[PDB]
Each structure stands twice: as structure tokens, then as C-alpha cells.
């Protein structure tokens, strides 16, 4: 079996697309329409570092992650047997499985990225070295009472979430822990994935109501429960992937467990494949 994975956030890249563009005329050209601007311009030449600002960076990562996906399709004829995508990519996902069309995901993701660039007074970091069951507690041990779990990346990978000097703070607990070998500061200034969203995810629901969805044709393993979409909650879902937490390792452990599976990462760079080979490896390992 194989899965498609589309990666989100931070996986943009001046130059991501290239070819891309010019084979996919019809939907670039759909593209610009709904943006306003060039969406092949702001790929490849990066004006005013706009691809770091997420308004725009969203828009460019579901569309160069589409246009992959259909250039693969085509070229290799075959389509995955399920589709996952990181946070962002999850669009990508619900794109590939035919529950929008290339033009709502578009209007979608436009949301989102306006909404999430208005967030302010938050942080991220990535702490290295604990699970998640680790980090849950040692915020419970040491009061960082005001901090979320917003990713769960891969068996040591946690990413936490919440108001910039509550974050800060508790970036500095985490490097003073035993198995903490890295704590690092996200680019971002909204406290994503946690509670500080529910308000923008209450925008976002009720916004999704105007638009069309239709049953997947292809099993989309959710962010918010790592199992399948269903058809009815699929506007709930994908507007509580805004205030909950990314199960990614759950996501990718559900899939594996199917058997024989493969995964390609589809868009930008390798970072799902690097955390999908960590999760590989550690459910190769024993307890102790
Ligand atoms: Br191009
Ligand atoms: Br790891
Ligand atoms: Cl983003
Ligand atoms: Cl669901």
C-alpha cells in the first residue's frame, strides 16, 4: 500500500514549484484569479520575503503541494491508497481524495492564512528528546499551566504552543530536563494548535459553511484523530485542526499498522519523510 503525505509550514522555499507553473496553466491561471497576484511569481521570486509571511505562505504551499500531486497522478498513473498532510498539507490531503475542488482548497487556505497572520503574542518551539507523555506531565509537574500541546511530530519530537512569555519560559524548563537535547524556537508569533485558536477556529467553522464538500474518494487519516474523515464531520474537523493539537505520529503509527506501507512525500522538501523514518525506526525498538 502507499500513502501521500504533504508537508506544511516551513517547508516553503524560494523556487518550490519550478516547472510546475507552466505545466498547470489552467490552474495557475485559476490561481492568480481568487489571489489577486502571481502565484508563480511569489514561488520562484520570493518579493519582500512574502513567502515567510503566512498570509502567503499558505496559498503557496497548497497550491505547488496540488500541482505536485496532479503531476504525479499523470506521470505515474496510480493514485495512493490513503493521503495525510501536515497541518496546512491536510488541505493537500482533502484536495488528492476529491472533497473540494482545486478552487475552493484555494479560498480555504486564503482564509486560513489571513486569519492566522492577524495572531499575535504567541510562540512555538520544538523540544527534542521527550515523548508526549513526558512532555504532558513535566507541564503539569512544573506549572506551565498556560502552554498546549500543538504537535505530535515523532517519538521525540513535541512541538508546544501558548503566549510568548509563558513559551519562553517554558523552553528554558525543558533545556534544563535530562532527555532535552534541543529546544527550538518556531517562526511564528501566533500560539497555533492550542487554545489561544478557538476563537479563530470559531471564524473558520462557520465560515466553511458557505462552501461545497463531497464524500472522499480517497481515506484522509485527520490531524485532530489520526483515523479516517467522515463526510459529516469533515467542516467540523477540519475546523478543529486549528485549536488541537497535529497527531502526526498517531497518524502515520494507524497507517503502518495496515501492513505493508509506503509512504512518498509529495510537495517541498523531506521533513515528513525525516519524521516518518523516525517513527519507523522507533517502533522497530523494544520496551525496556
Ligand atoms: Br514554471
Ligand atoms: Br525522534
Ligand atoms: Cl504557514
Ligand atoms: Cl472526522
Same mark, same amino acid.
Not at 477540519?238 to 501492513?259: E, P, R
Given at each position: 500500500?502507499?500513502?501521500?503525505?504533504?508537508?506544511?509550514?516551513?517547508?516553503?522555499?524560494?523556487?518550490?514549484?519550478?516547472?510546475?507553473?507552466?505545466?498547470?496553466?489552467?490552474?495557475?491561471?485559476?490561481?492568480?484569479?481568487?489571489?489577486?497576484?502571481?502565484?508563480?511569481?511569489?514561488?520562484?521570486?520570493?518579493?519582500?520575503?512574502?513567502?515567510?509571511?503566512?498570509?502567503?505562505?499558505?496559498?503557496?504551499?497548497?497550491?505547488?503541494?496540488?500541482?505536485?500531486?496532479?503531476?504525479?497522478?499523470?506521470?505515474?498513473?496510480?493514485?495512493?491508497?490513503?493521503?495525510?498532510?501536515?497541518?496546512?498539507?491536510?488541505?493537500?490531503?482533502?484536495?488528492?481524495?476529491?472533497?473540494?475542488?482545486?478552487?475552493?482548497?484555494?479560498?480555504?487556505?486564503?482564509?486560513?492564512?489571513?486569519?492566522?497572520?492577524? =495572531? !499575535?503574542?504567541?510562540?512555538?518551539? /520544538?523540544? *527534542?528528546?521527550?515523548? #508526549?507523555?513526558?512532555?504532558?506531565?513535566? %507541564?503539569?509537574?512544573?506549572?506551565?499551566?498556560?502552554?498546549?500541546?500543538?504537535?505530535?511530530?515523532?517519538?521525540?519530537?513535541?512541538?508546544?504552543?501558548?503566549?510568548?512569555?509563558?513559551?519562553?519560559?517554558?523552553?528554558?524548563?525543558?533545556?534544563?530536563?535530562?532527555?532535552?537535547?534541543?529546544?527550538?524556537?518556531?517562526?511564528?508569533?501566533?500560539?497555533?494548535?492550542?487554545?489561544?485558536?478557538?476563537?479563530?477556529?470559531?471564524?473558520?467553522?462557520?465560515?466553511?459553511?458557505?462552501?461545497?464538500?463531497?464524500?472522499?474518494?480517497?481515506?484522509?487519516?485527520?490531524?485532530?484523530?489520526?483515523?479516517?474523515?467522515?463526510?459529516?464531520?469533515?467542516?467540523?474537523?477540519?475546523?478543529?485542526?486549528?485549536?488541537?493539537?497535529?497527531?502526526?505520529?498517531?497518524? =502515520? !503509527?494507524?497507517?503502518?499498522?495496515? /501492513?505493508? *506501507?509506503?509512504?512518498? #512525500?509529495?510537495?517541498?522538501?523531506?521533513? %515528513?519523510?525525516?519524521?516518518?523514518?523516525?517513527?519507523?525506526?522507533?517502533?522497530?525498538?523494544?520496551?525496556?
Amino acid at each position: 500500500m502507499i500513502t501521500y503525505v504533504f508537508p506544511g509550514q516551513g517547508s516553503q522555499k524560494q523556487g518550490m514549484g519550478s516547472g510546475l507553473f507552466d505545466e498547470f496553466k489552467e490552474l495557475t491561471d485559476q490561481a492568480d484569479e481568487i489571489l489577486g497576484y502571481s502565484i508563480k511569481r511569489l514561488c520562484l521570486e520570493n518579493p519582500y520575503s512574502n513567502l515567510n509571511k503566512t498570509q502567503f505562505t499558505q496559498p503557496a504551499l497548497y497550491v505547488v503541494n496540488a500541482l505536485s500531486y496532479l503531476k504525479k497522478i499523470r506521470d505515474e498513473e496510480v493514485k495512493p491508497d490513503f493521503v495525510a498532510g501536515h497541518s496546512l498539507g491536510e488541505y493537500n490531503a482533502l484536495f488528492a481524495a476529491e472533497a473540494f475542488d482545486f478552487e475552493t482548497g484555494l479560498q480555504l487556505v486564503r482564509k486560513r492564512g489571513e486569519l492566522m497572520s492577524l =495572531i !499575535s503574542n504567541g510562540g512555538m518551539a /520544538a523540544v *527534542m528528546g521527550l515523548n #508526549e507523555e513526558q512532555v504532558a506531565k513535566a %507541564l503539569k509537574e512544573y506549572h506551565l499551566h498556560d502552554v498546549d500541546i500543538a504537535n505530535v511530530n515523532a517519538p521525540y519530537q513535541i512541538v508546544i504552543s501558548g503566549k510568548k512569555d509563558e513559551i519562553e519560559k517554558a523552553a528554558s524548563l525543558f533545556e534544563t530536563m535530562t532527555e532535552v537535547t534541543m529546544v527550538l524556537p518556531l517562526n511564528v508569533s501566533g500560539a497555533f494548535h492550542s487554545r489561544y485558536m478557538n476563537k479563530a477556529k470559531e471564524e473558520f467553522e462557520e465560515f466553511l459553511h458557505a462552501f461545497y464538500f463531497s464524500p472522499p474518494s480517497i481515506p484522509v487519516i485527520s490531524n485532530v484523530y489520526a483515523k479516517p474523515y467522515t463526510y459529516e464531520f469533515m467542516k467540523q474537523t477540519l475546523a478543529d485542526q486549528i485549536n488541537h493539537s497535529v497527531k502526526w505520529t498517531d497518524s =502515520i !503509527s494507524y497507517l503502518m499498522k495496515k /501492513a505493508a *506501507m509506503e509512504f512518498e #512525500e509529495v510537495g517541498p522538501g523531506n521533513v %515528513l519523510t525525516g519524521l516518518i523514518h523516525r517513527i519507523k525506526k522507533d517502533a522497530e525498538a523494544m520496551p525496556r
